[PDB]
Each structure stands twice: as C-alpha cells, then as structure tokens.
C-alpha cells in the first residue's frame, strides 16, 4: 500500500511511521513545511501508525529527542512515540478490508486528515485548535495536549478496569473533534475501506 505523509504546517515535524516492534518504511523522515514522504507500506500490516514529531533534534547518526512523539531517541522510529501524539491508525487486509481512525487517546499534537486516495470510503480529520483550547491539566511542558491516562494514570481515564466512561477531559477532544476516537471506549469512529487502499496523511489539512 501507499501512504503520502505532507507536511502542510509551517513548521517542521519529523513525520514517523511504525507498526510498534518494526519501522514501516523509513520509519521516519525530516518534513519542514511543504515537504512530502511517500513511503510503501506492507499488505497485511496490523497495528500500524503514523504520527508527526515535533521540535526535534538529531545528530548524525539519527539519535537525539523530540518535545512531542519521541521513539525511542530514533529518528527512523522502530517503536511507538511519546504522548502527545495526534495518531493515525490503520490495520490493512483484515479479512479483506482495511480499518482506518484517528485517535487522541495518546494526547493531541499536530492537526491531521487521514483519508483514501483511492475509492469507496471516507476519510476523517481533527483538525480543531486542540493546543490552543488545551485545559490547563492537559497542556504538554514540551508543547502539545497530553490526554487525560497520561496523565492521572488511573483507569477512570485508562480503561483498564471496570468500563470506563467519557471525562470533561476525553468530552473536549470529542467535542472538538468528533471524528477521532476520545477515550478507549469511544463509540468508534473507525471507517471500513476496501481491503489494499492508498491513503494519505496530512498536517495541518488545508480547510
């Protein structure tokens, strides 16, 4: 499959791309504004994720550390990033369909859209000012809106135990974006595309 990854920001983000035990592709890339990743991901890729990282630094040998979305100090991600992290989540060719959502239950860093480039289903964005309405508990020392597990780490914001409900904190990223997935137990917003899609991401989505 095919994933464009654009930076449509003005600032630089180090897009990442990761399945959580392996890099997709790359694994990650330097995207300053404008710039534009197109990596290959392999047909039956379960789990995969893609995110931006923001105000990084690496050295030559790609290590070093980002504010928002780290992995590991790589700059080619082999695992999972940092909170906060606007994600992008696909499983490809599950049972002959592929499922797509954005998610904030790991916080909110960069605005992002997450759609099909080929046919037969939608796409779906959070694209709100979440940092900038971000409740004062929430905002991220680094930049970004960390979620509210992150940060309490108990399961009435974890859904661990019991079965969890909606918070004032996982209500303002569903009331700010409706379409990405608020807290574990969020009535899903997962769309259903035909099995060996294209897709594209994009920060900072043109309104």
Do not use: H
């Not at 995207?31 to 534009?36: K, Q, R, V, Y």
């Not at 971000?134 to 019991?162: M, R, W």
């Amino acid at each position: 499959a095919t994933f464009e990854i654009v930076n449509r920001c003005s600032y630089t983000v180090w897009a990442a791309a990761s399945k959580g035990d392996a890099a997709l592709d790359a694994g990650g890339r330097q995207l300053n504004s404008g710039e534009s990743w197109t990596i290959n991901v392999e047909p039956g890729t379960n789990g995969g994720k893609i995110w931006a990282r923001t105000d990084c630094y690496f050295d030559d040998s790609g290590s070093g550390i980002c504010k928002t979305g780290d992995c590991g100090g790589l700059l080619r991600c082999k695992r999972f990033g940092r909170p906060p992290t606007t994600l992008a989540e696909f499983s490809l060719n599950q049972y002959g369909k592929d499922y797509i959502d954005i998610s904030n239950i790991k916080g909110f860093n960069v605005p992002m859209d997450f759609s099909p480039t080929t046919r037969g289903c939608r796409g779906v964005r959070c694209a709100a000012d979440i940092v900038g309405q971000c409740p004062a508990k929430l905002k991220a020392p680094g930049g970004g809106c960390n979620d509210a597990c992150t940060v309490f780490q108990t399961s009435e914001y974890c859904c661990t135990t019991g079965k969890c409900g909606p918070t004032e904190y996982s209500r303002f990223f569903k009331r700010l974006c409706p379409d990405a997935f608020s807290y574990v137990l969020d009535k899903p917003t997962t769309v259903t595309c035909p099995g060996s899609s294209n897709y594209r991401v994009t920060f900072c989505p043109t309104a």
